[PDB]
Design an enzyme around this catalytic site. Structure first.
Site, PDB file in Angstrom:
ATOM      1  N   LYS B 243      28.430   5.294 -54.239  1.00 49.55           N
ATOM      2  CA  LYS B 243      27.150   5.696 -54.541  1.00 49.55           C
ATOM      3  C   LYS B 243      27.522   6.760 -55.633  1.00 49.55           C
ATOM      4  O   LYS B 243      28.525   7.810 -55.242  1.00 49.55           O
ATOM      5  CB  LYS B 243      26.414   6.297 -53.761  1.00 49.55           C
ATOM      6  CG  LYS B 243      24.913   6.353 -53.691  1.00 49.55           C
ATOM      7  CD  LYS B 243      24.056   6.312 -52.669  1.00 49.55           C
ATOM      8  CE  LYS B 243      22.623   6.331 -52.986  1.00 49.55           C
ATOM      9  NZ  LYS B 243      21.582   5.854 -51.769  1.00 49.55           N
ATOM     10  N   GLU B 365       6.555 -15.471 -42.878  1.00 53.46           N
ATOM     11  CA  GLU B 365       5.353 -15.523 -43.763  1.00 53.46           C
ATOM     12  C   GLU B 365       5.643 -14.080 -44.687  1.00 53.46           C
ATOM     13  O   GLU B 365       5.082 -14.395 -45.904  1.00 53.46           O
ATOM     14  CB  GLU B 365       4.170 -14.746 -42.734  1.00 53.46           C
ATOM     15  CG  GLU B 365       3.785 -15.899 -41.698  1.00 53.46           C
ATOM     16  CD  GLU B 365       4.320 -15.850 -40.616  1.00 53.46           C
ATOM     17  OE1 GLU B 365       5.311 -14.846 -40.350  1.00 53.46           O
ATOM     18  OE2 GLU B 365       4.225 -16.926 -39.837  1.00 53.46           O
ATOM     19  N   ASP B 423      -6.573 -19.936 -27.486  1.00 56.25           N
ATOM     20  CA  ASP B 423      -5.193 -19.233 -27.902  1.00 56.25           C
ATOM     21  C   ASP B 423      -5.112 -17.729 -27.372  1.00 56.25           C
ATOM     22  O   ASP B 423      -4.042 -17.325 -27.079  1.00 56.25           O
ATOM     23  CB  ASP B 423      -4.738 -19.300 -29.098  1.00 56.25           C
ATOM     24  CG  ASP B 423      -3.954 -20.945 -29.314  1.00 56.25           C
ATOM     25  OD1 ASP B 423      -3.323 -21.334 -28.262  1.00 56.25           O
ATOM     26  OD2 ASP B 423      -3.433 -21.296 -30.574  1.00 56.25           O
TER      27      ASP B 423
HETATM   28  C1  LIG Z   1       4.217 -14.938 -36.712  1.00 56.62           C
HETATM   29  C2  LIG Z   1       3.607 -16.517 -36.325  1.00 56.62           C
HETATM   30  N1  LIG Z   1       3.685 -17.434 -37.224  1.00 56.62           N
HETATM   31  C3  LIG Z   1       3.148 -18.690 -36.946  1.00 56.62           C
HETATM   32  C4  LIG Z   1       2.838 -18.974 -35.646  1.00 56.62           C
HETATM   33  C5  LIG Z   1       2.035 -20.077 -35.262  1.00 56.62           C
HETATM   34  N2  LIG Z   1       2.993 -21.044 -34.305  1.00 56.62           N
HETATM   35  C6  LIG Z   1       2.868 -21.116 -32.904  1.00 56.62           C
HETATM   36  C7  LIG Z   1       1.403 -20.856 -32.094  1.00 56.62           C
HETATM   37  O1  LIG Z   1       0.738 -20.007 -32.858  1.00 56.62           O
HETATM   38  C8  LIG Z   1       1.369 -20.790 -30.735  1.00 56.62           C
HETATM   39  O2  LIG Z   1       1.892 -19.360 -30.438  1.00 56.62           O
HETATM   40  C9  LIG Z   1       0.614 -22.365 -32.691  1.00 56.62           C
HETATM   41  O3  LIG Z   1       1.211 -23.158 -31.867  1.00 56.62           O
HETATM   42  C10 LIG Z   1      -0.759 -22.510 -32.260  1.00 56.62           C
HETATM   43  O4  LIG Z   1      -1.094 -22.462 -30.800  1.00 56.62           O
HETATM   44  C11 LIG Z   1      -1.343 -23.715 -32.908  1.00 56.62           C
HETATM   45  O5  LIG Z   1      -1.338 -24.161 -34.240  1.00 56.62           O
HETATM   46  C12 LIG Z   1      -2.942 -23.836 -32.758  1.00 56.62           C
HETATM   47  O6  LIG Z   1      -3.278 -25.213 -33.120  1.00 56.62           O
HETATM   48  P1  LIG Z   1      -4.937 -25.662 -33.210  1.00 56.62           P
HETATM   49  O7  LIG Z   1      -5.189 -26.545 -32.142  1.00 56.62           O
HETATM   50  O8  LIG Z   1      -4.608 -26.615 -34.461  1.00 56.62           O
HETATM   51  O9  LIG Z   1      -5.739 -24.462 -33.202  1.00 56.62           O
HETATM   52  S1  LIG Z   1       4.213 -21.835 -32.032  1.00 56.62           S
HETATM   53  C13 LIG Z   1       4.893 -22.000 -33.597  1.00 56.62           C
HETATM   54  C14 LIG Z   1       6.217 -23.077 -33.561  1.00 56.62           C
HETATM   55  C15 LIG Z   1       7.174 -22.270 -32.629  1.00 56.62           C
HETATM   56  O10 LIG Z   1       8.522 -23.225 -32.835  1.00 56.62           O
HETATM   57  P2  LIG Z   1       9.611 -22.752 -31.759  1.00 56.62           P
HETATM   58  O11 LIG Z   1       9.967 -21.275 -32.078  1.00 56.62           O
HETATM   59  O12 LIG Z   1      10.857 -23.595 -32.233  1.00 56.62           O
HETATM   60  O13 LIG Z   1       9.234 -22.695 -30.346  1.00 56.62           O
HETATM   61  P3  LIG Z   1       9.200 -24.043 -29.388  1.00 56.62           P
HETATM   62  O14 LIG Z   1       7.642 -24.193 -29.292  1.00 56.62           O
HETATM   63  O15 LIG Z   1       9.809 -25.167 -30.183  1.00 56.62           O
HETATM   64  O16 LIG Z   1       9.985 -23.774 -28.152  1.00 56.62           O
HETATM   65  C16 LIG Z   1       4.266 -21.747 -34.800  1.00 56.62           C
HETATM   66  C17 LIG Z   1       4.486 -21.835 -36.285  1.00 56.62           C
HETATM   67  C18 LIG Z   1       2.961 -17.829 -34.444  1.00 56.62           C
HETATM   68  N3  LIG Z   1       2.329 -18.126 -33.477  1.00 56.62           N
HETATM   69  N4  LIG Z   1       3.275 -16.720 -35.042  1.00 56.62           N
HETATM   70  C1  LIG Z   2      10.509  -0.839 -47.315  1.00 60.92           C
HETATM   71  C2  LIG Z   2      10.758   0.431 -47.740  1.00 60.92           C
HETATM   72  N1  LIG Z   2      11.269   1.352 -46.788  1.00 60.92           N
HETATM   73  C3  LIG Z   2      11.890   2.580 -47.139  1.00 60.92           C
HETATM   74  C4  LIG Z   2      11.988   2.927 -48.358  1.00 60.92           C
HETATM   75  C5  LIG Z   2      12.368   4.408 -48.755  1.00 60.92           C
HETATM   76  N2  LIG Z   2      13.768   4.131 -49.588  1.00 60.92           N
HETATM   77  C6  LIG Z   2      13.633   4.517 -50.695  1.00 60.92           C
HETATM   78  C7  LIG Z   2      12.574   5.329 -51.714  1.00 60.92           C
HETATM   79  O1  LIG Z   2      11.428   5.123 -51.473  1.00 60.92           O
HETATM   80  C8  LIG Z   2      12.849   4.771 -53.154  1.00 60.92           C
HETATM   81  O2  LIG Z   2      12.287   3.477 -53.580  1.00 60.92           O
HETATM   82  C9  LIG Z   2      13.061   6.664 -51.571  1.00 60.92           C
HETATM   83  O3  LIG Z   2      14.281   7.084 -52.163  1.00 60.92           O
HETATM   84  C10 LIG Z   2      11.923   7.843 -51.965  1.00 60.92           C
HETATM   85  O4  LIG Z   2      12.102   7.770 -53.531  1.00 60.92           O
HETATM   86  C11 LIG Z   2      12.364   9.174 -51.868  1.00 60.92           C
HETATM   87  O5  LIG Z   2      12.389   9.267 -50.226  1.00 60.92           O
HETATM   88  C12 LIG Z   2      11.216  10.109 -51.931  1.00 60.92           C
HETATM   89  O6  LIG Z   2      11.470  11.453 -51.571  1.00 60.92           O
HETATM   90  P1  LIG Z   2      11.027  12.696 -51.684  1.00 60.92           P
HETATM   91  O7  LIG Z   2      10.963  13.663 -52.839  1.00 60.92           O
HETATM   92  O8  LIG Z   2      11.076  13.413 -50.443  1.00 60.92           O
HETATM   93  O9  LIG Z   2       9.291  12.323 -51.753  1.00 60.92           O
HETATM   94  S1  LIG Z   2      15.403   4.143 -51.151  1.00 60.92           S
HETATM   95  C13 LIG Z   2      15.771   3.940 -49.751  1.00 60.92           C
HETATM   96  C14 LIG Z   2      17.332   3.915 -49.486  1.00 60.92           C
HETATM   97  C15 LIG Z   2      17.911   2.493 -50.172  1.00 60.92           C
HETATM   98  O10 LIG Z   2      19.349   2.548 -49.873  1.00 60.92           O
HETATM   99  P2  LIG Z   2      20.090   1.147 -50.420  1.00 60.92           P
HETATM  100  O11 LIG Z   2      19.323  -0.047 -50.245  1.00 60.92           O
HETATM  101  O12 LIG Z   2      21.365   1.218 -49.903  1.00 60.92           O
HETATM  102  O13 LIG Z   2      20.129   1.478 -51.884  1.00 60.92           O
HETATM  103  P3  LIG Z   2      20.936   2.429 -52.838  1.00 60.92           P
HETATM  104  O14 LIG Z   2      20.266   3.515 -53.368  1.00 60.92           O
HETATM  105  O15 LIG Z   2      22.189   3.181 -52.033  1.00 60.92           O
HETATM  106  O16 LIG Z   2      21.757   1.686 -54.024  1.00 60.92           O
HETATM  107  C16 LIG Z   2      15.105   4.091 -48.888  1.00 60.92           C
HETATM  108  C17 LIG Z   2      14.965   4.329 -47.459  1.00 60.92           C
HETATM  109  C18 LIG Z   2      11.465   1.984 -49.374  1.00 60.92           C
HETATM  110  N3  LIG Z   2      11.522   2.343 -50.528  1.00 60.92           N
HETATM  111  N4  LIG Z   2      11.173   0.629 -48.990  1.00 60.92           N
HETATM  112 MG    MG Z   3      23.259   2.012 -50.692  1.00 66.31          MG
END
Ligand SMILES: Cc1ncc(C[n+]2c([C@](O)(CO)[C@@H](O)[C@H](O)[C@H](O)COP(=O)(O)O)sc(CCOP(=O)(O)OP(=O)(O)O)c2C)c(N)n1
Ligand SMILES: Cc1ncc(C[n+]2c([C@](O)(CO)[C@@H](O)[C@H](O)[C@H](O)COP(=O)(O)O)sc(CCOP(=O)(O)OP(=O)(O)O)c2C)c(N)n1
Ligand code: MG
Ligand code: MG
Ligand code: NA
Ligand code: NA
EC number: 2.2.1.1
Lengths: 620, 620
Positions: B243, B365, B423
């Site tokens: 750095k 997502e 659900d």
């Molecule tokens: C963050 C996140 N993203 C996506 C999901 C969706 N989901 C799950 C459910 O939501 C259950 O928690 C899903 O079954 C719903 O209940 C269902 O779609 C509703 O159906 P409807 O009758 O059409 O309304 S569970 C799941 C798959 C997980 O797979 P796994 O981790 O391998 O687990 P396993 O079941 O094999 O042991 C998904 C994508 C959620 N919940 N969260």
């Molecule tokens: C999702 C996410 N989480 C956290 C951060 C914060 N951040 C960064 C900045 O936001 C720049 O993008 C940060 O410097 C701000 O500009 C600064 O804090 C503002 O300061 P003020 O004067 O007090 O207002 S950059 C960063 C570190 C990244 O480290 P790296 O990946 O190793 O990259 P390198 O710089 O060494 O090559 C963090 C935590 C952001 N942006 N996003």
């Molecule tokens: Mg770094």
């Protein structure tokens, strides 16, 4: 304490238990007409072994602080969680058949109205982070003997939040934590990417610092042995299973996720499973070593009043760090978490004073929130997590789930609005009021000076639910006396006269812009009432309307936030239909850009000159 | 095309270039008084080699569809991005000194008002996902020769979204994608967790399916060779750097992240760096192979009107999948993405008909949204991504950044509200209107039947910005004729009479509950006007007020959403102060629970009986 190496009859009893758990999972979901029996069935041996060989807990007191913790990250397997707590004697058998009914608390996914549930996990990929917070607490805060076990799905492992937790656990040497991966080959709508490539799961876990053991997830023996052995580092039990295990015709098949068995089929399959059970006698749970300390439940008070001086200039971000460090001297319950932003949020001040109670979470906001939720479970700590408010949008699902989990966490988001200046919009929180107001258990503090900030920290510490404190980058004058009394839902009138024309509601930088507008307007012989909400949620509707009635019904809101979901909409919603009351809004209308703070307040129409013009237009 | 193995003079020119890039990064940030020169300096050889040896692009046409893509994921290194585009001849040298000024477009982090920027990346951990979408598009849609290069920080690698992208790239065999990891040991406020443990980075990358090469990131030779060699799979160049490289006294030190050099220091350091430059002559960019196809920019129209029948019952989630598949027959530009929920969102219908244009994103997502953003860059595709609306909260920062990126993506979130039933709350979207309304470029569609859903899909396809379509699980009656005309910002009065007492605004299930309330009320000789917004944002304020003036000024909003940020607040904010106008709200007041859809609508006060009672209370 020695591993107890089970005999063949204990092993058969564990098989019998697993099969009972399958039968109940089927019965309950068929009765409900919905649910996920195939997701229960892949986990049945895992659940039997954890609950009836490995873990230590009080079966009649699931929340007991000495107990091992179990987190069902794959929360749609809830019916088998309920079944194990009936098997353990806590739940009545008969209640299992009331799954998903409005008359029951055996809801579709686990929730903390259930004594045996600490965190709600229906949104996949979050349970391991909560488990990390529980384990961190066990090892470093409670310094207790309980272990933490977290069951994940294989599809679930696609969530990045899981890998943040994986990395956290190895950084912090969580050798009291076990992740069980139900590698049943399938997700919801297709095979999981890696299917039964057990070796790649092992390589991923090992690369992230875990001890990784591949097992046959349907072998009670192999499970007992792998769970029995502790483990110097976080341990991943990578269990090869089949989805729908034990359901003839359904095991290992697509098109069965979240599909209950029809009655006719359930009856036939249950008779098959039942035929394999060799005894009805149930195994008993084994209790824990009672070495978790007492924790204090009293109010946490600042050790003294604020010590600012009216007229001195300080940014509320810096007042936050000062106040949090101060509060940490009053109680050992306070812990602080931050995502590699401690020098910018000023949580570094707490780290300096109380290093043993600071948790560096690195650039991983999702996991940070989940760690906080886990630390707050069973009231073991009072967490304050900080980053830029903009980056709390990265953790909105964790925050949303924290409210479903009835969690008491405190979140302080800095760098709100365009007033940060030159970094530009990626860093500017313009949607955080919308976000946090939509969280049903939330209290939203928007302190406008250092005094109000200190008071907000103290109040938040003692307030249940999701507390959010919005802090700001510009240094602004202290306007409040140190002994000013502050309360949740109580605003302040910071400027008034008997001839005020408009009530101007501002907060943070826009409060100070409103005060500066008042001075501009005085030149024109126009007086304005200026009101500081203190809390955006709940909003002091009474003082706002009393104010508006003193100022010809006219309210002007001005905020460093987008129009939707912020202060102006909160006010409008509170007063709509009140006779004679009008509300005019000034906010930020589009994605901003870089410039000096004052230049951006001007560009986006929320500085003193914009305020003064809106006031004059109302008067005409 | 052969690797051109550079001579020592080309290598020296690349070193000279890297050093020029350091000098500019320092000059610009010192001039601005803010920025991140030490984060620029670790990347200077990487940037010189990518822009002046490896990549192929039109220097005068950065957006050209044939060009290699470069994504600066570590967006705070923006000054060195600007410097390379000045070195390439696109930007004027002198403009670099205007970094972060309100008079310049060289803003603090990259944004697409800059021709050379496709996606905004100031929120860390998002650039690789966008790069994956670009690479997927290059390999599978455009079928073109361009490559995609993405530069990440080491602290940045703590974000889970990065690992989702890592996994996506190996699933989809993105052998046209290169990730460069700037392993400079340090994050913002502490060393990054792994510091200079290059071997663990390599193991993590390899475990996630990438070809991983450790290099000296300050060796132009090693960089040329590693970048030159293609690569059958996504390739990670794991660059050991320091750095602040080249800044005597600052290289490899803490306490310098985001700190500009003071003037006196900048001058001394720049003279040092300058002393090491052996020629002022600049290297020229090399242009691409022009093999990207033409893409159509015309309106996309459904091939026929909807073919529903009034009175038939269909859930809007299922109408969405039908409509999206239909629209895919009209244009090859339409692509669909889903996160292992295609059987529940009904995007599976599109997959069946148009499999080559469906992208399974698995339970990830965040990454899904970023893939969509990347696919939409340079207008190459028109993406529709789907999951449950509740799980779009997992991607809010990606959505927020998509608006900062001026991206045209379409998002369809199903399973809104308590009406999903059993659900429970983890699956229930109750904050999605708040969320999407706060996104400044958004259009929010809330179709209430299958016809409106099809029209919303078509309109969204042809609407710029962040389009959100909220779909529902209950089957509800078709109420609109197939030839009903629909427009963004135009509501519909679905029931009226000349003696209407209240204007009831509902949407989705609550529209149908309002219609059922109207039938209940008829028994009492009370008529109500019922209004379907169609779009929540923008809201048809004119028709709402015209309606309210026909119904004694009285408006009742009813929504399957929390109170904050939804329909009721949108309406209140639109009409507050209008003489004689009142607004009463019915919404969901707290975290729900499991039960049948009708039971939960009752419990939470938004069903036909709740509506009828509120109407009667207004009349009195
Ligand atoms: C963050 C996140 N993203 C996506 C999901 C969706 N989901 C799950 C459910 O939501 C259950 O928690 C899903 O079954 C719903 O209940 C269902 O779609 C509703 O159906 P409807 O009758 O059409 O309304 S569970 C799941 C798959 C997980 O797979 P796994 O981790 O391998 O687990 P396993 O079941 O094999 O042991 C998904 C994508 C959620 N919940 N969260
Ligand atoms: C999702 C996410 N989480 C956290 C951060 C914060 N951040 C960064 C900045 O936001 C720049 O993008 C940060 O410097 C701000 O500009 C600064 O804090 C503002 O300061 P003020 O004067 O007090 O207002 S950059 C960063 C570190 C990244 O480290 P790296 O990946 O190793 O990259 P390198 O710089 O060494 O090559 C963090 C935590 C952001 N942006 N996003
Ligand atoms: Mg770094
Ligand atoms: Mg699975
Ligand atoms: Na609190
Ligand atoms: Na669109």
């Amino acid at each position: 304490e020695s591993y107890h190496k089970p005999d063949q009859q204990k092993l058969q009893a564990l098989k019998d238990t697993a099969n009972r758990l399958r039968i109940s999972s089927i019965q309950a979901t068929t009765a409900a007409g919905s649910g996920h029996p195939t997701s229960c069935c892949s986990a049945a041996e895992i659940m039997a072994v954890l609950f009836f060989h490995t873990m230590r807990y009080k079966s009649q007191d699931p929340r007991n602080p000495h107990n091992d913790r179990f987190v069902l990250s794959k929360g749609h397997a809830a019916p088998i969680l309920y079944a194990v707590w009936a098997e353990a004697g806590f739940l009545a058998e008969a209640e299992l058949l009331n799954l998903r009914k409005i008359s029951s608390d055996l809801d579709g996914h686990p929730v903390p109205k259930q004594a045996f549930t600490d965190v709600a996990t229906g949104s996949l990929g979050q349970g391991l982070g909560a488990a990390c917070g529980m384990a961190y607490t066990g090892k470093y805060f409670d310094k207790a003997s309980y272990r933490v076990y977290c069951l994940l799905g294989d599809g679930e492992l696609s969530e990045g939040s899981v890998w943040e937790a994986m990395a956290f656990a190895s950084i912090y040497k969580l050798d009291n934590l076990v992740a069980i991966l139900d590698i049943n080959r399938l997700g919801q709508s297709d095979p999981a990417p890696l299917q039964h490539q057990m070796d790649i799961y092992q390589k991923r876990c090992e690369a992230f610092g875990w001890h990784a053991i591949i097992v046959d997830g349907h072998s009670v023996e192999e499970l007992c042995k792998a769970f029995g052995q502790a483990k110097h580092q976080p341990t991943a039990i990578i269990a090869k299973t089949f989805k729908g295990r034990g359901i003839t015709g359904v095991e290992d098949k697509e098109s069965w996720h979240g599909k209950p068995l029809p009655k006719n089929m359930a009856e036939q399959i249950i008779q098959e499973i039942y035929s394999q059970i060799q005894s009805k006698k149930k195994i008993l749970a084994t209790p824990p070593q009672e070495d978790a300390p007492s924790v204090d439940i009293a109010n946490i008070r600042m050790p003294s009043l604020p010590s600012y001086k009216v007229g001195d200039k300080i940014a509320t971000r810096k007042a936050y760090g000062q106040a949090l460090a101060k509060l940490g001297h009053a109680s050992d319950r306070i812990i602080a978490l931050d995502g590699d932003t401690k020098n910018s949020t000023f949580s570094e001040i707490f780290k300096k004073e109380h290093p043993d109670r600071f948790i560096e979470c690195y650039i991983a906001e999702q996991n940070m929130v989940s760690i906080a939720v886990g630390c707050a479970t069973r009231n073991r700590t009072v967490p304050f997590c900080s980053t830029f408010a903009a980056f709390f949008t990265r953790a909105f699902d964790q925050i949303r789930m924290a409210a479903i989990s009835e969690s008491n966490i405190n979140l302080c988001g800095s760098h709100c609005g365009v007033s940060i200046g030159e970094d530009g919009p990626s860093q500017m929180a313009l949607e955080d009021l919308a976000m946090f107001r939509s969280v049903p258990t939330s209290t939203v503090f928007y302190p406008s000076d250092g005094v109000a900030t200190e008071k907000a920290v103290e109040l938040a510490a003692n307030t249940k639910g999701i507390c959010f404190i919005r802090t700001s980058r510009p240094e602004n004058a202290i306007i409040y006396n140190n002994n000013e009394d502050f309360q949740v839902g109580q605003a302040k009138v910071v400027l008034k006269s008997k001839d005020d024309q408009v009530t101007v509601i501002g907060a943070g930088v826009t409060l100070h812009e409103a005060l500066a507008a008042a001075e501009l307007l005085k030149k024109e012989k126009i007086n304005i009432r200026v009101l500081d909400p203190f809390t955006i949620k709940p909003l002091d509707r009474k003082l706002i309307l009393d104010s508006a009635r003193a100022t010809k019904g006219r309210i002007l809101t001005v905020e460093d936030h987008y129009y939707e979901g912020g202060i102006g909409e909160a006010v409008s919603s509170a007063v709509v239909g009140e006779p004679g009351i009008t509300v005019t809004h000034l906010a930020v209308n589009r994605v901003p850009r870089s410039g000096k703070p004052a230049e951006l307040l001007k560009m986006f129409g929320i500085d003193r000159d914009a305020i003064a013009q809106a006031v004059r237009g109302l008067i005409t």
